[PDB]
Structure formats: structure tokens, C-alpha cells
Design a protein around this ligand. Structure first.
Ligand code: NHJ
Length: 264
């Protein structure tokens, strides 16, 4: 509904990142409004032929509105790069939260998973699978709530896509890694992995090699440290089913006794 320009902003502190662009804290000059400016170089994009995933990323996040789904405001682009005007999440990533504490207690773990479910429950309702729920794509709002960002690798569902893969499978279901066709259940496997990683402090399928992990994932080989309670073990075991149709619906997850017992 309106076109901006790099001149309308005052870039600030580097929030971070790598490859195509660095996300900056920026300031809309007219309203003094705070936000994050994600800078992507065309040379990076073009050469990797991502044009469509950025057009997809920018189009979906372009509408979705949820408390837990980081907002995309619009964009613009000069000679050598494209800019994405994003919402700014005050508390950073959930990834640093985890490095910071090592592991989370059943309360945040129960909360993020809930917020995450309500978050996914929304995109699913619009046949939009995320397919990329790693803690690195999870941010925190000023109140500390989870906010799903980066809808790049996102697509509609059901889908068959096999896209030369990101480096890590750690968060992908047996169906996506095996190149096979998949649907919305793909985000439920991820939610299970993301839950385990929160409590144990490491992903359920972590290995040393790409091939080692792929083996561990496809045979769904995961064990529990002693401190993980039956309550969580249970939930994580219902999500980590090799066969998509056996994973729960997001209501059953928001209902799980363990989630209700510790979600604030
Ligand atoms: N290290 C801090 O103190 C810190 C980090 C991030 C933020 N907030 C924020 N909001 C929105 C976008 C964004 N970029 C960003 C950073 C890393 C990864 C990603 C990714 F795109 F991968 F999700 C985006 N970062 C605030 C403080």
C-alpha cells in the first residue's frame, strides 16, 4: 500500500546473521517507529536461485497475522539489494535463550510449545506448512513470547517439493528427507523435536555427519535423559512417529496433560 526507500530509515545495531543479508535494528524517520531491516543481496539470491522462495516468503508472511508469527511490513530494493521491513523482536532468538541456559524447564518448554502450536494452528488453517521450525527461526517479543519468523522455506499444503536441502535435517520428518511427498504433519514432527531440544538441550537426532543423522531420523532413533519426565516423554513420543497420520492434531497437543499442567 506504499513504497519505501533506504532513505526512510536509519539503520542501527546489527542483530546479526549471514549469507544473503544482515538484519539491522532500524528507525522509520517519519514516525520514529522501531523495526528490523533484513538486507538481502541480489547476487546472493540470484546465484542460488531463491527468487521464488523470497517471493513466497515475502508473500505469505505478507498476510499472516498472529501474535506469534513475526510480521512482514513490506519491502523495497535499490541497485544491488532487496530490503525486507520486519517486526523487531526485543528479546532475540530462542536459540540464544537455549545457549544461555543450556536447557529449559517444563514451564517455558510447555509455554513456547503452546504459543508455537497456536501459531502453527493458524498457518495450517490456511494450508501453509512452515517446514522450518528450528530454534533459530524462533524470536521473542518484549513480553518474552515466541514469534515464528522467516517463512522462506515455507509452502502451501499438500506439497511434494524436494529442494536441495539446507545443511541440517535435524528438524525434518522422515518424509521430507526421503524426498517423498508431505503435508502439514511436517510441522508436528518438528514441534516434537523442538520440544525435546528445549528440555534436553540438544536435538533428539543430533549426529556428527549428515548421513549419520539421516539414518537416526529415518529409523526414528531417539533416547531420553533420565530427568525427562514421563509426561513430556509421552508427548514427544506421540509427535515423533515415522508415519505422519499418527502424529496428533494441534488441539490434542494444546490438550496434552503435560502441556496443560505446565503452560502458563
Ligand atoms: N542478539 C540479539 O540481542 C538480538 C537478536 C535478534 C533480535 N531481534 C530480531 N528481530 C527480528 C529479526 C531479527 N533478525 C534475525 C536474527 C537472527 C536470525 C534470524 C532468522 F531470520 F534466521 F530468523 C533473524 N532479529 C534482537 C536482539
Amino acid at each position: 500500500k506504499r513504497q519505501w526507500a533506504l532513505e526512510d530509515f536509519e539503520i542501527g545495531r546489527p542483530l546479526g546473521k549471514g549469507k544473503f543479508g544482515n538484519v539491522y535494528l532500524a528507525r522509520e524517520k517519519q514516525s520514529k517507529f522501531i523495526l528490523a531491516l533484513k538486507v538481502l543481496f541480489k547476487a546472493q539470491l540470484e546465484k542460488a536461485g531463491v527468487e521464488h522462495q523470497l517471493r513466497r516468503e515475502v508473500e505469505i508472511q505478507s498476510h499472516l497475522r498472529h501474535p506469534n508469527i513475526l510480521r512482514l511490513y513490506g519491502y523495497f530494493h535499490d541497485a544491488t539489494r532487496v530490503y525486507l521491513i520486519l517486526e523487531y523482536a526485543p528479546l532475540g532468538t530462542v536459540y540464544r535463550e537455549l545457549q544461555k541456559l543450556s536447557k529449559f524447564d517444563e514451564q517455558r518448554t510447555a509455554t513456547y510449545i503452546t504459543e508455537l502450536a497456536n501459531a502453527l494452528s493458524y498457518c495450517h488453517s490456511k494450508r501453509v506448512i512452515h517446514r522450518d521450525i528450528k530454534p533459530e527461526n524462533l524470536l521473542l517479543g518484549s513480553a518474552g513470547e515466541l514469534k515464528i519468523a522467516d517463512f522462506g522455506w515455507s509452502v502451501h499444503a499438500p506439497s511434494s517439493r524436494r529442494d536441495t536441502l539446507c545443511g541440517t535435517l535435524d528438524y525434518l520428518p522422515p518424509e521430507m528427507i526421503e524426498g517423498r511427498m508431505h503435508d502439514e504433519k511436517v510441522d508436528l514432527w518438528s514441534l516434537g523435536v523442538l520440544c525435546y531440544e528445549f528440555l534436553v538441550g540438544k536435538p533428539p537426532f543430533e549426529a556428527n555427519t549428515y548421513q549419520e543423522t539421516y539414518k537416526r531420523i529415518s529409523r526414528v532413533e531417539f533416547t531420553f535423559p533420565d530427568f525427562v519426565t514421563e509426561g513430556a516423554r509421552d508427548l514427544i513420543s506421540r509427535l515423533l512417529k515415522h508415519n505422519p497420520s499418527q502424529r496428533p492434531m494441534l488441539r490434542e497437543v494444546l490438550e496434552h496433560p503435560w502441556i496443560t499442567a505446565n503452560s502458563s
